[PDB]
Amino acid sequence: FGSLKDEDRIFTNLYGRHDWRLKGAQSRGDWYKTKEILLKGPDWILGEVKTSGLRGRGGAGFPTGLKWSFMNKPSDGRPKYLVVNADEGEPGTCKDREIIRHDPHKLVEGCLVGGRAMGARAAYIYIRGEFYNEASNLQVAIREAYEAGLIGKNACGSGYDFDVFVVRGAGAYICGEETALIESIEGKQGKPRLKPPFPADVGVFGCPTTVANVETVAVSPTICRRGGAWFASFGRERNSGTKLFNISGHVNNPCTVEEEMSVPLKELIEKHAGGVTGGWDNLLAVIPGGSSTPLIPKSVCETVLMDFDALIQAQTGLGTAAVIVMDRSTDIVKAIARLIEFYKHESCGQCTPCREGVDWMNKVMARFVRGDARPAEIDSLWEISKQIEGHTICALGDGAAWPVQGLIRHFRPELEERMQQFAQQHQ
Amino acid sequence: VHRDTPENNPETPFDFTPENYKRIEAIVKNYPEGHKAAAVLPVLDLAQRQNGWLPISAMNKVAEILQVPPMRVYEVATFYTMYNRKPVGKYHIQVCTTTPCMLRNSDSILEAIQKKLGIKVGETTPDKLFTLIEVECLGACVNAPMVQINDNYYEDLTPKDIEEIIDELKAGKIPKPGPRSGRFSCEPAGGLTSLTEPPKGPGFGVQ
């Protein structure tokens, strides 16, 4: 990992933000060399990302480099599409929508340059309609370029070019899975399918699709434009790259910054800009993932670098790429229930473990917080959480327990004493 | 709320403006043929727009256009959230309350509305124009307890200036759907500068 950073220069993977929002020639960075890329054999791009080997921003492992050079090697009778989440499911994510808001010109390229690797046919994106204003403008960004003849059907210089069809959702979590999105792109109700039909690259719209994420297809052109040997810059021999973090919930100026891997949380939280709560003596009870990781106390987290597998060393890792912390007044038990009260409303409801199994917790979590009937429950409530893992289809269950699974870990007494606080009270 | 209809507007009636039948040519144009059969997500919502909440004869109408048995519609309108089956107001407002939005005390931008606006939660204002809810997972938690109105959002708010954002709206004034205070784009501040540059003299991986 080198020098234990993760610095930020003007040399980064994102071109500009406050400079130019509208259309043009991509005055400096973008749309630079194209006809040379596409005219060379497609699999040249395939595995040429391996110089980086992006883990992927979809909240998981499984480097993006494999799945595209993965099946969808051949082609037979039926077209292939691209479905790239723009959605945000996790509370406090916020990383998305900043990419789109002030610089859309990147991703329409990101597909066209990207889609050629798939050998795909069309391009769908998807956006939660809950963003009405910013998402409305992409069409202009599509038009303001696409109208110039930059895309389709040969554009430019190849015999292969195809346009991008925006769509919208409503009350979606649906980006909560692939093999759901490709279902509610269709117009059924969205109940995500079983994971191994034929996994997500066989059963699809009518025909094989691949579900990418935003900065997985956003940073691909610039990492195939230059690459290197700088493609692997920071992070150890395992995880490599520089992703975006967006700090939220206590800071001086919670705001995004581009930061490379293996950055410790004690300098990163304090920096960009201040630590404005107590940098210490505010107890710094932290959540690595947005909703997908339980607490860490004042322990090795602060020296624990943000590298992925570095976090699996602790009791939980995070792929979500977000930060929420706390200081003093926020009662964690009080502040984790409204993370659970959230889950109960976003779940499909097919499976018997998820449905009727999350409420069993959510109905009891309003006992502990309020303070109420006796311990030895905690010992059970742990087993429930241990009882939903292989039992649910999607990850929302595997992402349902961890907050409670990792609350019972790391804080014993805060509960034990409160059940007394109402016990002595009853007396 | 309940998900059964007590025969309100079986024949409301309802219909689309002949200006709208020329767009539905474009929507179906998106999809391949023979599977078309659901464009329902925009088409059912466009109908909400022409009206402002869709009665049960709206749900029956699109079926005659899309030839799907209209329990393959009443379903889809009871799953998602954005659609409003019952009537609403002129402004349908949201207060994001979630772990991050709780940490910055969204209750600030929430109540002190009851003392201002003078209505309870989940209840439309006695006339029309205002109602109140709260939701989860929209936009940014990087901002303050941000608030949504209808088609826009007011980022980085505080109890002081939201008194205005409603009250200037009661006057008919629309105050800039952006993070009014602090940094306008939600900037890093701490390396915002960066001095943008062309991409380092390309010709790189030409090989």
């Binding site: 409305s136 109208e147 | 474009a26 998106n30 391949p32 043929e33 023979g34 599977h35 727009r49 209808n150």
Partner: peptide, 28 residues
């Protein structure tokens, strides 16, 4: 900013410029 009026957005440049579609059939 335009609360209604998705029209020309959907029906102006998109309507003429979304070719063909072939899209096949699927009769069914």
């Amino acid at each position: 900013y335009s609360t209604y009026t998705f029209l020309d957005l959907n029906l102006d440049l998109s309507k003429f410029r979304m070719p063909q579609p072939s899209s096949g059939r699927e009769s069914p």
